[PDB]
Write a protein that binds this ligand. Structure first.
Ligand SMILES: CC(=O)N[C@@H]1[C@@H](O)[C@H](O)[C@@H](CO)O[C@H]1O
Ligand SMILES: CC(=O)N[C@@H]1[C@@H](O)[C@H](O)[C@@H](CO)O[C@H]1O
Ligand SMILES: *[C@@H]1O[C@H](CO)[C@@H](O)[C@H](O)[C@H]1NC(C)=O
Ligand SMILES: *[C@@H]1O[C@H](CO)[C@@H](O)[C@H](O)[C@H]1NC(C)=O
Ligand SMILES: [Xe]
Ligand SMILES: [Xe]
Ligand SMILES: [Xe]
Lengths: 532, 532
């Protein structure tokens, strides 16, 4: 049986899933770790003990315990990101889509979900790997990992809650893939990790961590980078936040042991209920429990790692979307709402800047304000809206990624960069939000190939285009087909810094993505903030 | 006789001068002060003792002692600004052009030359008042004043060299005009002061100084403003420079008396020979001996005066040229020369920024560099040249003027603003220098009306246009003719901030001149420099 697979952990039995007038095999909810429940909460993950008999891998697993978005109840735009399974601390499972007939040894793609490290699920409809697996004949894996306090609570010095354990969950899943994917027909020598936002940051973190480097071949980073301002904190900030969590739940704080024992006796939802209260500033695009620069997963600071080339040297493909910031302004900044054009006043504007750069003094806020205001028309609600959108996206996603990319390419073996700026024809979010954080994913996973989804033909072709770039890069380290008539995605180099747009129009090549603003964010503002 | 005039100082006899196929009367070299020679060097001026008999006012007077530009010997472009008479400390004279027949009581215009307070002459060909006087039927006066150490050496506390005495020379000439111009047919109630660069700054200084305010009716400021960074220094910087001058000439420095007695025994040229050595920084557009904020001529700081409205409330007309900086880059910055396109390298660029903002720390230099670099093409020699040109002009002329204008208009009774961007057809300077500091003057004084000068017809019409605006504003406080078919120069207001271009094309109205860059220079950079 195609649906029966014997692994080093035990036998698994899958299920046949139809896809695009055909079928493939799916192995859903395979365990790669022991349930991190009870006294194991906050601990590093443990490998799953092998099992006798046959593991039923015919249904999706539980999702990890997480904050749930209720901002727009019943609205597909936001609920599509919410967990679609029962939530549980027993959530360390992975899913595999395998072409039929079973390959012998083909390209493997492993997806790491995003969600600001406070959320996410491997089981979402927009992450269904069957179209990709089927259309590009790759073995498609999606992993899971602990989020929020369960995954990133950090009390540096202790071994009960060391921090970064969510990252170690990813790593453990990458290890199981390395050791077992051959039985599903995958080539563990040709494994590509890919993820979006916190997932793309994660990908870059595995590139940096000496401990993950060997578990994969190449990497794809979508709208995220390891050095994003929201993706990590110091060991000292991590512990302040942990203690403050303890304070919100009336814990004994005399010591780490006391604190930790208190938090392990709380129900998951009690933790989640107070999670947002531990942020140090009134801010947007900032998350409570995130990776920590601990001197182990991350031996030194990221900048130090990037500058010295202390990282995996291989090929990467990566890029951003045109309106990365709009999601966060809608949810948190004044003046923005779902059902209006969200034309923004000067007052709201400057209040948005303060929220967007919570760590800056007044001079720096000023600097930001100056760079993004048109002083010939400073009261234009639309210009104000759009400038804040660029601020949030530039500072939190694009410019950190551009810095990663330039730093990386100096030592890497190949970089491919893109800019995704297609506004999908069937978007349910308002037009002012433009090309939103996360809305390239449905194209990467081939949803427009599905008729009832209502995409145009141009959109299906775009999807097919993007899938073949990703899968081809995964297989060979280059998104381009050598013997192809189609236009060439050029290599990003130090010198020329070329990139492509991704949309339904003919490929256009550009250079130095957002270089004017990223010099501000990556060089000037940090210098200002240190000198002041 | 039309050429004979009895004043309160004594009788004067003029001369008939031909102008544009006609003739007018000229009274040249009339004394308004005692020769500030000997023990009077550096002192406040003294009114000229009246004389018996008839003063021969048929020839131009001596020019004041000044640095002479030899950078391009024999080149008309620079020598046209050099003194064209014998230099002398006995130089406090004024010149008057009077329509024929002698008016009864008409509009009076008084010209104050520029030259960075280290130089200038009332007798230059580009300052010949006969065309203006003749074409607009105004009584045209040009004054003179001490420059360099002779006029602005400042040892605050002493009465031998108090500083600002060059300004007091201007004031004394304005007093004589007030008291005597009626005899030449002028209306001392309707006197307009006008000047360019240090002359325009001077004009604005007389608007501020409670002591000059009453001596004139309205003001015209060309390419200059009282608050320019180069136009004044503190009493403490003034004295440092004076002492350093003393140091360069081996003076006794035990006290002001010693220092001053030493400097009065030196020949003029010995002072001039070391003048440039006392600047505090390697800089461009910075002058050694300038007005001092002394708490008398200027009761408080200028900003304080402008903010509180402590100034003459009347009408003003003022404006700038498109390439104010090029002159100073040519003479002082690396990469620039007279006979090349002066395409500028990144190295030269950043060395130009340092020279242009000598008082900034590295963070501020950075800020400047960022605002004026195109980071998509940072090695473009032409973009680099042009950005440095804008830097020098923005920081030293336009943005200080825009700040003056906005501050002034809040309390004044009428503002008219312009932007002069005509490159004269017969310019002898290279094209990269564009529309240069000082090259609006020849249009204001009507030189294009003179056939042998080689201007086009469009240029003559432009000139005629500009003269009639200036003279009409002088007469009524508005450059526009009420009953006129021609298009209207709109009033500058706080709200709308409108201005006009001045060139051979049809009038176009704009708003908020260089507002993007002047917010940087007038608000952000000063805040940065104080916080750092
Ligand atoms: C995938 C999708 O959104 N389907 C839409 C549905 O919402 C709508 O009711 C109808 C047409 O308006 O069918 C289509
Ligand atoms: C006012 C002026 O510059 N005159 C120019 C002169 O320089 C030149 O020699 C000749 C034509 O080239 O006559 C004209
Ligand atoms: C990648 O590595 C191979 C083998 O070392 C090398 O020959 C090739 O030029 C490199 N490619 C890039 C883009 O650096
Ligand atoms: C100038 O002053 C007059 C008289 O006070 C006033 O009526 C007029 O409105 C003022 N003009 C401007 C432009 O303020
Ligand atoms: Xe994409
Ligand atoms: Xe800036
Ligand atoms: Xe002008």
């Amino acid at each position: 049986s195609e649906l029966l697979v014997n692994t080093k952990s035990g036998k698994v039995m899958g299920t046949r899933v139809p896809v695009l007038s055909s079928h493939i095999s799916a192995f859903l909810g395979i365990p790669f770790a022991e349930p991190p429940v009870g006294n194991m909460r906050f601990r590093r993950p443990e490998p799953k003990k092998p099992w006798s008999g046959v593991w039923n891998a015919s249904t999706y697993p539980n999702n990890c315990q997480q904050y749930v978005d209720e901002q727009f109840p019943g609205f597909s735009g936001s609920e599509m990101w919410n967990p679609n399974r029962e939530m549980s601390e027993d959530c360390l499972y992975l899913n595999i889509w395998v072409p039929s007939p079973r390959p012998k040894s083909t390209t493997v793609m492993v997806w790491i979900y995003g969600g600001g490290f406070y959320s996410g699920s491997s089981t979402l409809d927009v992450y269904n790997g069957k179209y990709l697996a089927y259309t590009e004949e790759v073995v498609l894996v999606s992993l899971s990992y602990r989020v929020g306090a369960f995954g990133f609570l950090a009390l540096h010095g202790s071994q009960e809650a060391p921090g970064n354990v969510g990252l170690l969950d990813q790593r453990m899943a990458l290890q199981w893939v390395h050791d077992n994917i051959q039985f599903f027909g995958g080539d563990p020598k040709t494994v590509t990790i890919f993820g979006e936002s916190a997932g793309g940051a994660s990908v870059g973190m595995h590139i940096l961590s000496p401990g993950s480097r060997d578990l994969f071949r190449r990497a794809i980073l979508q709208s995220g980078s390891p050095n994003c301002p929201w993706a990590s904190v110091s060991v000292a900030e991590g512990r302040r936040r942990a203690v403050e969590l303890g304070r919100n739940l009336n814990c004994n704080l005399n010591s780490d042991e006391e604190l930790i024992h208190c938090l392990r006796e709380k129900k998951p939802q009690e933790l989640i209920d107070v999670e947002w209260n531990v942020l140090p500033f009134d801010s947007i695009f900032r998350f409570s429990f995130v990776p920590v620069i601990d001197g182990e997963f991350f031996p030194t600071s990221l900048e130090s790692m990037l500058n010295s080339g202390n990282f995996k040297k291989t090929q990467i493909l990566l890029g951003v979307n045109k309106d990365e910031g709009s999601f966060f302004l809608l949810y948190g900044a004044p003046g923005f709402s779902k059902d209006s054009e969200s034309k923004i006043s000067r007052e709201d504007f400057m209040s948005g800047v303060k929220l967007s750069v919570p760590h800056a003094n007044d001079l720096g806020l000023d600097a930001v304000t100056l760079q993004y205001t048109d002083w010939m028309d400073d009261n234009n609600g639309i210009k104000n809206r759009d400038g804040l959108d660029d601020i949030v996206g530039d500072h939190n996603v694009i410019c950190p990624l551009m810095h990663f990319v330039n730093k990386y390419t100096k030592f890497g073996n190949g970089t491919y960069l893109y800019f995704f700026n297609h506004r999908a024809s069937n978007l349910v979010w308002p037009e002012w939000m433009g090309v939103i954080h996360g809305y390239e994913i449905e194209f990467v996973f081939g949803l427009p190939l599905v008729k009832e989804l209502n995409y145009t033909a141009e959109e299906e072709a775009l999807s097919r285009r993007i899938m073949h770039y990703w899968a081809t890069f995964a297989k060979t380290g280059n998104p381009n087909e050598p013997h192809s008539q189609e236009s060439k995605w050029p290599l990003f180099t130090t010198k020329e810094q070329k990139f492509i747009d991704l949309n339904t129009e003919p490929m256009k090549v550009h250079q130095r993505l957002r270089v004017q603003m990223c010099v501000f964010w990556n060089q000037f503002l940090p210098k200002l903030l240190n000198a002041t």
